[PDB]
C-alpha cells in the first residue's frame, strides 16, 4: 500500500513496556519519555538489541522526575529538577 511522509523514531525500550507505549496505557518508560497519540498511525516495529547494545552505559538515561505527564507531539528535552516544594530547587540536590 502506498503512503507518504513516513517518520522514524529511535527509543531504548526495556521490553515489557511495548504493550503500554500504545494509547490507553503508560509504561515504565512511556510514562515520562515516550508517547503515542490517541489514535497512533503506522505500525509497531521492534527487534532484539540486548546482545549488542548492553555491555552499564547510562548515556540513554530515561527521565524520571518532571513537571507532569506527556502531551501529544512534545519533546522531553528540558532537563530541570522537579520542584515538589516551595523552596527553590537551585543549589543541586535537596529534600
Amino acid at each position, epitope marked *: 500500500l502506498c503512503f507518504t511522509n513516513v517518520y522514524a523514531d529511535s527509543f531504548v525500550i526495556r521490553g*515489557d513496556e511495548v504493550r503500554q507505549i500504545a494509547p490507553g496505557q*503508560t509504561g*515504565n518508560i512511556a*510514562d515520562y519519555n515516550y508517547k503515542l497519540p490517541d489514535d497512533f498511525t503506522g505500525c509497531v516495529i521492534a527487534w532484539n538489541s540486548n546482545k549488542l547494545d548492553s555491555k552499564g552505559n547510562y548515556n540513554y538515561l530515561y527521565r*524520571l522526575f518532571r513537571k*507532569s*505527564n506527556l502531551k501529544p507531539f512534545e519533546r522531553d528535552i528540558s532537563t530541570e529538577i522537579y520542584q*515538589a516544594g516551595n523552596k527553590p530547587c537551585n543549589g543541586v540536590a535537596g529534600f
Partner: nanobody, 126 residues
Framework: QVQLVESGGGLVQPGGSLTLSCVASESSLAPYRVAWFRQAPGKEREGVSC??????????YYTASVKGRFTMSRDNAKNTVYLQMNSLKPSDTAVYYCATDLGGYCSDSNYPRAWWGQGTQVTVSS
C-alpha cells in the same frame, strides 16, 4: 491539597497482625502512586512499600525488611491504600506515614514524597 489520614496503629504482641488505613480526602488517589513510610525516633524516614496507579505486583515494591511479611493493597474504586502487616517484630515499631505525589508508577528507588499524612503509631511489644 490532597489530605491523607493514617489509622489502624496500636499496641500488638510480637508475631501479631495489624491493618493500616490511609484515608485520602479532597482528591482521588487512583491515578497516582502511593507509598508507606515509617520513622523510628532518632532514625530518619525510610520507605516501607509503594503501589503504583495500575496496582500490579510488578509495579508494587516492598523494602527488604518487609518483603514477604507486609502486603501492599490499594482500592482505586474507593480511594484508599492499606498495608496488611503481619508476623510482627519489635523492629517494626515506628510511626507509619503514607505519601503520594503526581507520579503514576513506583520504582524500587523512587517513592512518592510530595504530600504526607499525620502518621499512625505502631508498637510491637508486650
Amino acid at each position: 491539597q490532597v489530605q491523607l489520614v493514617e489509622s489502624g496503629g496500636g499496641l500488638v504482641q510480637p508475631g501479631g497482625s495489624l491493618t493500616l488505613s490511609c484515608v485520602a480526602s479532597e482528591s482521588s488517589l487512583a491515578p497516582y502512586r502511593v507509598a508507606w513510610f515509617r520513622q523510628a525516633p532518632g532514625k530518619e524516614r525510610e520507605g516501607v512499600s509503594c503501589i503504583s496507579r495500575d496496582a500490579h505486583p510488578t509495579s508494587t515494591y516492598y523494602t527488604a525488611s518487609v518483603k514477604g511479611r507486609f502486603t501492599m493493597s490499594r482500592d482505586n474504586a474507593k480511594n484508599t491504600v492499606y498495608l496488611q502487616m503481619n508476623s510482627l517484630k519489635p523492629s517494626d515499631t515506628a510511626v507509619y506515614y503514607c505519601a503520594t505525589d503526581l507520579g503514576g508508577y513506583c520504582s524500587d528507588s523512587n517513592y512518592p514524597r510530595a504530600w504526607w499524612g499525620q502518621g499512625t503509631q505502631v508498637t510491637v511489644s508486650s
